[PDB]
Amino acid sequence: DVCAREPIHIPGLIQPYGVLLVIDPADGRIVQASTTAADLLGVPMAALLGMPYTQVLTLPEAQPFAVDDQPQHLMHAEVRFPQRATPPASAWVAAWHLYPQQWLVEMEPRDARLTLREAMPLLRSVERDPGIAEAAVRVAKGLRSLIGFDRVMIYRFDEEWNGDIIAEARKPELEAYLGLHYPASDIPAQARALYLRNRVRQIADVGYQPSPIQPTVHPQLGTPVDLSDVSLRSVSPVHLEYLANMGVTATLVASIVVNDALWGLISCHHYSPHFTNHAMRDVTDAVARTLAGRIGALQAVARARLESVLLTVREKLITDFNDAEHMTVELLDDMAPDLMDVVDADGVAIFHGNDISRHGTTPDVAALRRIRDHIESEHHEALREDAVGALHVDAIGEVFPELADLAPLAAGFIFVPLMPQSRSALLWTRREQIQQIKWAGNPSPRKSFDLWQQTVRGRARRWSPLHLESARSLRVLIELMERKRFQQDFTLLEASLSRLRDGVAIIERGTANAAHRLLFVNTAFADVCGSDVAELIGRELQTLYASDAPRANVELLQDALRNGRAAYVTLPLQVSDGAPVYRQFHLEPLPSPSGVTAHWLLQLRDPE
Amino acid sequence: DVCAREPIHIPGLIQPYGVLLVIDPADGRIVQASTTAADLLGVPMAALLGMPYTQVLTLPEAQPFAVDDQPQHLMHAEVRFPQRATPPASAWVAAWHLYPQQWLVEMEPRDARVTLREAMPLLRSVERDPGIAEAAVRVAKGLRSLIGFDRVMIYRFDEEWNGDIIAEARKPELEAYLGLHYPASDIPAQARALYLRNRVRQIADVGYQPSPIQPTVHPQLGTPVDLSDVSLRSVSPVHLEYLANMGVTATLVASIVVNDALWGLISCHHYSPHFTNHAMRDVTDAVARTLAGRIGALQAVARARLESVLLTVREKLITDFNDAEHMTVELLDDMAPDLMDVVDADGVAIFHGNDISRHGTTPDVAALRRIRDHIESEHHEALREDAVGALHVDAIGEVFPELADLAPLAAGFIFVPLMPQSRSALLWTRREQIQQIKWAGNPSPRKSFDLWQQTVRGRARRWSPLHLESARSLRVLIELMERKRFQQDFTLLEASLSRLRDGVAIIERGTANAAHRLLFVNTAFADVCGSDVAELIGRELQTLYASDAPRANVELLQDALRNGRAAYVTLPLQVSAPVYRQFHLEPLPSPSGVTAHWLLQLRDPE
Ligand SMILES: */C=C/C1=C(C)C(=O)N/C1=C\C1=NC(=C\c2[nH]c(/C=C3\NC(=O)C(C=C)=C3C)c(C)c2CCC(=O)O)/C(CCC(=O)O)=C1C
Ligand SMILES: *C(=C)C1=C(C)C(=O)N/C1=C\C1=NC(=C\c2[nH]c(/C=C3\NC(=O)C(C=C)=C3C)c(C)c2CCC(=O)O)/C(CCC(=O)O)=C1C
């Protein structure tokens, strides 16, 4: 928090190995310059300030130019210093950063002796490597041989922005850092952000003399120099403290940017001073690029493969579960392996009112009932809201402290449906996975990096979002269960109704513009009318009584229908053939949650 | 296809610019060799054939070796020819393809003339710019300046393997090819497949003299040379015809391979002869890979963004839809915008037995009923089986020719559920999207490339697999609808039966375990007994009649219950006067026909 609040991009200091000048794109005048400029360029800080760059420039290659909006970056090219008699003992090379209001020229030694063509057999290998692990180690081993670093490691960022050394290539005599876990605070967010912008950075000598930009703020713009893109940018004195405490004298780290996000870093350490020249710096850029590219592709194909297997298994469960009308014991015992696999659970428990069907490695029925009871609690009603489609825990003891135990079999779980009481419910469980976090430290930078193995009990393997959506996708199985149950009970009650002696009908109350329709009619009611049951459903009630029926008796029926009340009247029926069939109409209003009657029960006593 | 039928990988011919030899990994002797070898190597085809390679070429950088299974490929390295009195008018460079039974050495001029270093500002720029379009044009403009080709274009493959020029950089004086559509037959599957294997190919001069491999078939293996990995491999005379008809003299194309699949190509044309040396072929591979990597990342972020918006909206619909027990008109009118957005439809229609709730831009009720009827057809049962979780069409006229019209509003659609009849159903519709496809020809290769704008009607915007999964994920609302309907009807029937004047009870059978128990009982049946409805549920049919009942009348009831048949007997009940009543036991239908429940009714005295 207070660590992440540090400029780091505007230190007003550079590394002493190179020289930096700030040029005004209108005049070509040097507005700001680092103290290291005076010694190489010839002219001291006095006249060097406010001087046209061309008088101290000898660039045989490309030249700087005006930029409209998007800045342009020119590569390291030969630079010579005319206002001095052979100032360097080594070849010098200058890079340009051209922004609309300022130009920045950074120059550093060429160095020579070591390159892109020799990196190609390595790049070509990782491009066709299977799995991130294989590529990561190939890159560390390969890069360690290409540049000459004492140790090269691939630092993968995890979900909480912590880090893990997943690959390492080092001098045999060195203590291995492989598999060591570092907190998220070691690389604060403001640094991580810059590591997407500036993808390769070097520290030639940890604890150097930082060379400051003479006018710290722009003499006419009043702004500090945004050294985000300058490779010479002086690094944090907190990181330089950490690096000295770790015993490293030189650094070179390149970002692994997968899908426009910092996936990890290629961290190189040298326990002696080491300047990585523009050439080696470009080679490490190419390997980081290729490694980020392969990781992404492998991750993309993986997801794509997993999603299609997980779909088949889901679609089989939806079909198999629909096809069977009565949910037998062998049905669920066949379903169980695929019902666990879809979400990658260690066990599953199917609930249907007091009954529980447990499969795989799950707690006992008493505990599965203890877990379900606890979730549907009034106390845990906020959890079900804040949950997305299914409630899930990675560590039962944290979320549900009263279910602290049960962690060995149901440490993690996916509970569906989010609706309380419900009758039908699915509970996927993952058992405890004792995790061993290999800290290189413990919880201003740390002096010691001693191994500290934190043993974490009561947690299960994290539910991947692929497995959480696979769960949400199977909510349809809960509604399948409920529908089929109400369907079974409804047809039973309809069968009992359709075979009654007394002739009954369920009337749906109309509206002002709608009329009262027959919703249900039994064979005894339909036969007294003449028409078959199917033809009479949806027929208006006003149809059933003869278009002759007395005013008084009809108005009594209409008054109850109008007011949603009850009626008992003898009315003649609309005769299909002849004989006047009078029946006594017993209209009774069926209860409504609002008390405002929505349906009636019409029954016509069968004479006996 | 008669196009793809051509085995373009075994032509028995090479491009004349380089030399090819087939070496036996046991002896090191040259078994086969292109006619261009004799002139370069010194020794003519006569003594050259069957000669140890070591005698005819000295390699100071890289040497061949034995391979066990997986072939190895050595890069272009310096090659010198000792059997000739100064044969190099230019520097020569040799590449090796080492297979377990054969070695293949292909050599071509070094050419020289800053390269991989100069490509770096371009590579760093594409990996940082947003959107495939921006990158594609950057690559064409950039690559045109790096390797000086007259025109550079980015050819993106579509769903039906056709191709579209999405980016172009050309000599100003040249007629633009940008936005032109080419058929899938122009690059046969045979070629596309090879373009995954061999990632960069060049034609130095279209209509060259093809130099053949002297023993066309291996002298001891009897097989033709699989030139699939060889850069000198002679190209099809059909493409060379096409290229000459288009007026191009030189070509260089590199594959854009996104997630191990051919996404497109970087096609370069030169209207004068042009040989691209190993170095610029490596530079164009680096840009093709960086562009393929940028395309993939942008596609990955896109999916990631879409999946998270589609999720929120889907869970907004599952909650809102569950919360309401009464499906009001304003209910569905509130749901409608989010119900259309989840699948990115232009309209939606909710069905629930004869009723239809139309929202957005959708056809009329008569048409929505015409469509639904057509899907649940007997002669269209093959579609719903072959469909995954939801049936969907991109162009209604193709799949359903009788539904040829309707396309202006329901050109595309997603229908859920796949089960026929089923009272509840959702139909998402996308309206027609008239496409203007700009052909460079018309339907042996075409002589003319004249513009032909096909005005494509009757199709809608393609249903992304993400929207299709967003649809499958909302199958739960169809089951929500059906559950809530059966629940509403069941409580209604339960309320009704619990009046009726006549005493009613539903008897569950006494299978093996237990006896025949009361499943349901109405208030009229419970009152004649004495006990309340709740206490009487679960009780045996034996417990509610009191020990005063005659043997014969009881045995008549017992006989029907035993056989799963019907009865009608007068039996006394439990006296809380004994109270006799007409026991009318009727067997309720079963799917097996084997009776599982009965309807007991006791006619109320009148
Ligand atoms: C302010 C809190 C910090 C603590 C505590 C600490 O240890 N570091 C803190 C701050 C910063 N770290 C910065 C950069 C940084 N951190 C790492 C971490 C590692 N490097 C390693 O080699 C290993 C293990 C071998 C670890 C865990 C790296 C690699 C970097 C970047 C170094 C580089 O790119 O050169 C940082 C930003 C500094 C800057 O770039 O200006 C801060 C403030
Ligand atoms: C049917 C056969 C064919 C017709 C008709 C036709 O026109 N070509 C046919 C066959 C083959 N084409 C092959 C390769 C190929 N085709 C293209 C297409 C284009 N290139 C362009 O520049 C444009 C428009 C500007 C189109 C359209 C391309 C780029 C290639 C690959 C060229 C290369 O990689 O060098 C082949 C395979 C030939 C081979 O490589 O052996 C056949 C057969």
Q: Return the residue in A354, A472, A479, A604 with the most chain B beta carbons within 10 A, the one to mutate for interface testing.
A: A479
My answer on whether omega of the bond before B417 falls inside 30° of 0, hence cis, is yes
How far apart (Å, rounded) are the C-alpha atoms in residues B151 and B143? 10
Contact flag B259-A297 (C-beta cutoff 8 Å): yes
Method: X-ray
Please, what sign has the CA dihedral across residues B365, B371, B372, B378? Answer: positive
- Residue-wise DSSP of B574-585: ------EEEEEE
Name the DSSP class of B3: T
Contact B472, B455 (CB under 8 A): no
My answer on whether omega of the bond before A71 falls inside 30° of 0, hence cis, is no
* CA distances from residue A355 to A358, A361, B508 in whole angstroms, order as listed: 10, 18, 19
Determine the 3-state secondary structure of A169 from DSSP: strand
How far apart (Å, rounded) are the C-alpha atoms in residues B403 and B396? 7
How far apart (Å, rounded) are the C-alpha atoms in residues A432 and A408? 5
Contact flag A496-B473 (C-beta cutoff 8 Å): no
Element (H, E) at A572: strand A567-572
Which residues is B217 bridged to in the sheet?
A: B224
Beginning with the edge strand found earlier in the chain, give each strand of the sheet holding A435-440 in spatial order.
Answer: A200-203, A250-258, A261-270, A151-157, A163-170, A181-182, A435-440, A451-456
Query: What are the tokens at A5?
Result: 């609040």
Residue at B198: amino acid letter: N
Contact A296, A258 (CB under 8 A): yes
Contact flag A296-B301 (C-beta cutoff 8 Å): no
Contact flag B519-A479 (C-beta cutoff 8 Å): no
Contact flag B120-A504 (C-beta cutoff 8 Å): no
Which residues from chain B sit within 8 angstroms of residue A285, using beta carbons?
120, 124
Among protein residues, the one whose CA lies closest to atom 8 of ligand 1: A186
> How far out from the chain centre does Cα B210 lie?
41
Contact A499, B497 (CB under 8 A): no
How far apart (Å, rounded) are the C-alpha atoms in residues A449 and A562? 85
- From the CA of B192, the nearest ligand is 2
Query: Which of B6, B182, B186, B268 gets mutated to test ligand 2 (max ligand atoms within 8 A of its CB)?
Result: B186
How far apart (Å, rounded) are the C-alpha atoms in residues B147 and B254? 13
Residue at B66: amino acid letter: A
- Exposed e or buried b per residue across A37-74, where buried means at least 16 C-beta atoms within 10 angstroms of its C-beta: bbebbbbeeeebbebebeebbebeeeebeebeeeebeb
Determine the 3-state secondary structure of A25 from DSSP: coil
| Residue A445 Cα to ligand 1 middle (Å) | 10
- Is the Cβ atom of B250 under 6 angstroms away from ligand 2? no
On whether any CB of chain B is under 8 Å from the CB of A590, the answer is: yes
Which residues is B72 bridged to in the sheet?
A: B98
How far apart (Å, rounded) are the C-alpha atoms in residues A594 and B484? 18
| Chains A–B, number of C-beta pairs less than 8 Å apart | 169
Name the DSSP class of B409: H
Question: Residue A587: what are its φ and ψ, rounded to 5°?
Answer: -90, 120
Contact A467, A343 (CB under 8 A): yes
Closest CA to B375 of B343, B410, B338: B410
SS3 of A182-221: ECHHHCCHHHHHHHHHCCEEEECCCCCCCEEECCCECCCC
Contact B590, B603 (CB under 8 A): no
Closest CA to B254 of B276, B230, B287, B279: B287
- Exposed e or buried b per residue across B211-229, where buried means at least 16 C-beta atoms within 10 angstroms of its C-beta: bbbbbeebeeeeebbebeb
Q: Which ligand 1 atom is the nearest neighbour of the CA of A251? A: 35
Q: Hunting for tokens 């680092």 — which residue is that?
A: A34
**% helix, strand, coil for chain A, step of 5:** 35, 25, 40
On whether any CB of chain B is under 8 Å from the CB of A296, the answer is: yes
* CA distances from residue A375 to A344, A399, A418 in whole angstroms, order as listed: 22, 10, 9
Contact A582, A573 (CB under 8 A): yes
Contact B338, B315 (CB under 8 A): no
Count of all residues that appear for chain B in the document: 606
Closest CA to A234 of A266, A265, A211, A268: A211
Q: Which B residues in the span 479-498 are in contact with A, Cβ-Cβ below 8 Å?
A: 479-480, 482-483, 486-487, 489-490, 492-497
How far apart (Å, rounded) are the C-alpha atoms in residues A525 and A531? 10
| Residue A186 Cα to ligand 1 middle (Å) | 5
* CA distances from residue A600 to A489, A507, B300, B493, B523 in whole angstroms, order as listed: 21, 5, 58, 11, 17
Chain B CA closest to residue A317: B389
E strand map for A369-492: 391-393, 412-416, 424-430, 435-440, 451-456
Q: Which residues contact A73 (CB under 8 A, 6 or more apart)?
A: A95, A96, A97, A98, A229, B121, B124
- From the CA of A267, the nearest ligand is 1
Beginning with the edge strand found earlier in the chain, give each strand of the sheet holding B347-352 in spatial order.
Answer: B355-360, B347-352, B424-430, B412-416, B391-393
Q: How far is B128 from chain A (nearest CA, A)?
A: 8
Q: Which residues contact B346 (CB under 8 A, 6 or more apart)?
A: B340, B360, B361, B362, B409, B429, B430, B431
Name the DSSP class of B213: B
Among protein residues, the one whose CA lies closest to atom 29 of ligand 2: B267
Q: Which residues contact B524 (CB under 8 A, 6 or more apart)?
A: B499, B500, B501, B502, B503, B504, B604
| Residue B193 Cα to ligand 2 middle (Å) | 13
Query: What are the tokens at A61?
Result: 């290659």
When CB atoms are compared, the residue of B486, B496, B601 closest to A601 is: B496
How far apart (Å, rounded) are the C-alpha atoms in residues A284 and A266? 9
Query: What are the tokens at B443?
Result: 């339907």
Q: Hunting for tokens 């009650």 — which residue is that?
A: A493
How far apart (Å, rounded) are the C-alpha atoms in residues A283 and B221? 44
Determine the 3-state secondary structure of A317 from DSSP: helix
* Resolution of the solved structure (Å): 3.0
Task: Give the long-range contacts of residues A52-61, CB within 8 A, separation 24 or more.
Answer: A52/A27, A52/A28, A53/A21, A53/A23, A53/A28, A53/A29, A53/A105, A54/A28, A55/A82, A55/A83, A56/A30, A56/A81, A56/A82, A56/A83, A57/A82, A58/A82, A59/A94
Contact B106, B95 (CB under 8 A): yes
Closest CA to A342 of A372, A377, A306: A306
Please, what sign has the CA dihedral across residues B477, B480, B485, B486? Answer: positive
Name the DSSP class of B23: E
- Is the Cβ atom of B182 under 6 angstroms away from ligand 2? yes
| Residue A239 Cα to ligand 2 middle (Å) | 56
How far apart (Å, rounded) are the C-alpha atoms in residues A399 and B489? 40
Query: Which of A154, A180, A187, A202 gets mutated to test ligand 1 (max ligand atoms within 8 A of its CB)?
Result: A187
Q: Which B residues in the span 369-398 are in contact with A, Cβ-Cβ below 8 Å?
A: 388-389
Query: Which of A228, A231, A242, A251 gets mutated to test ligand 1 (max ligand atoms within 8 A of its CB)?
Result: A242
How far apart (Å, rounded) are the C-alpha atoms in residues A156 and A549? 87
How far apart (Å, rounded) are the C-alpha atoms in residues A92 and A95? 11
How far apart (Å, rounded) are the C-alpha atoms in residues B412 and B125? 39
How far apart (Å, rounded) are the C-alpha atoms in residues B447 and A406? 77
How far apart (Å, rounded) are the C-alpha atoms in residues A390 and B97? 55
In B107-197, which residue ranges form alpha helices assigned H by DSSP?
A: 116-126, 132-146, 189-197
Element (H, E) at B452: strand B451-456
Closest CA to B458 of B406, B407, B410: B407
How far apart (Å, rounded) are the C-alpha atoms in residues B504 and B204? 95
How far apart (Å, rounded) are the C-alpha atoms in residues A297 and B292? 10
Query: What are the tokens at B398?
Result: 């193709």
Contact flag A496-B519 (C-beta cutoff 8 Å): no
Name the DSSP class of B96: E
Q: Return the residue in B70, B326, B493, B525 with the most chain A beta carbons within 10 A, the one to mutate for interface testing.
A: B493
Contact A364, A406 (CB under 8 A): no
How far apart (Å, rounded) are the C-alpha atoms in residues A201 and A231? 6
Q: Hunting for tokens 């047809």 — which residue is that?
A: A491
Query: What are the tokens at B6?
Result: 């051509």
Contact flag A504-B496 (C-beta cutoff 8 Å): yes
Question: Residue A125: what are its φ and ψ, rounded to 5°?
Answer: -75, -55
Contact B401, B332 (CB under 8 A): no
Closest CA to B180 of B437, B513, B406, B3: B437
How far apart (Å, rounded) are the C-alpha atoms in residues A398 and A380? 13
Element (H, E) at A477: helix A476-498
Torsion angle, alpha carbons of A266, A270, A275, A279, to 10: -40
Contact B141, B169 (CB under 8 A): yes
Name the DSSP class of B175: P
How far apart (Å, rounded) are the C-alpha atoms in residues A594 and A586? 23
Q: Which residues contact A192 (CB under 8 A, 6 or more apart)?
A: A161, A262
Q: Is A528 exposed, middle or buried (0-12, 13-18, 19+ CB in 10 A)?
A: middle
How far apart (Å, rounded) are the C-alpha atoms in residues A24 and A282? 28
Element (H, E) at B76: strand B72-78
When CB atoms are compared, the residue of B297, B475, B486 closest to A487 is: B486
| Residue B420 Cα to ligand 1 middle (Å) | 62
Contact B284, B254 (CB under 8 A): yes
Among protein residues, the one whose CA lies closest to atom 20 of ligand 2: B267
Contact B191, B253 (CB under 8 A): no
Q: Hunting for tokens 């190419």 — which residue is that?
A: A286
Please, what sign has the CA dihedral across residues A237, A241, A243, A249? Answer: positive
Q: Return the residue in A496, A521, A594, A604 with the most chain B beta carbons within 10 A, the one to mutate for interface testing.
A: A496
B524: left (phi over 0), alpha (psi -120 to 50) or beta: alpha
On whether any CB of chain A is under 8 Å from the CB of B261, the answer is: no
- From the CA of B8, the nearest ligand is 2
CA-based max dimension of chain B: 136
Beginning with the edge strand found earlier in the chain, give each strand of the sheet holding A19-23 in spatial order.
Answer: A30-33, A19-23, A103-109, A92-98, A72-78
How far apart (Å, rounded) are the C-alpha atoms in residues B359 and B355? 13
Chain A CA closest to residue B599: A496
- Is the Cβ atom of B186 under 6 angstroms away from ligand 2? yes
Closest CA to A418 of B321, B304, B342: B321
Which residues is A201 bridged to in the sheet?
A: A253
How far apart (Å, rounded) are the C-alpha atoms in residues A4 and A8? 10
How far apart (Å, rounded) are the C-alpha atoms in residues A563 and A556? 11
How far apart (Å, rounded) are the C-alpha atoms in residues B558 and A12? 102
How far apart (Å, rounded) are the C-alpha atoms in residues A167 and A175? 14
In A234-277, which residue ranges form alpha helices assigned H by DSSP?
A: 237-245
SS3 of A72-122: EEEEEEECCCCCCCCCCCCCEEEEEEECCCCEEEEEEECCCCCCHHHHHHH
CA-based max dimension of chain A: 133
Q: Hunting for tokens 């290539």 — which residue is that?
A: A169
Name the DSSP class of B79: -
How far apart (Å, rounded) are the C-alpha atoms in residues B542 and B564? 16
- Residue-wise DSSP of B336-395: HHHHHHTTT-SEEEEEETTEEEEEES---HHHHHHHHHHHT-GGGHHHHHHS-SSEEES-
Q: Is A379 exposed, middle or buried (0-12, 13-18, 19+ CB in 10 A)?
A: exposed
Q: Which residues contact B571 (CB under 8 A, 6 or more apart)?
A: B545, B549, B553, B554, B557, B580, B581, B583
Q: Is B113 exposed, middle or buried (0-12, 13-18, 19+ CB in 10 A)?
A: exposed
Query: Which of B239, B439, B450 gets mutated to test ligand 2 (max ligand atoms within 8 A of its CB)?
Result: B239
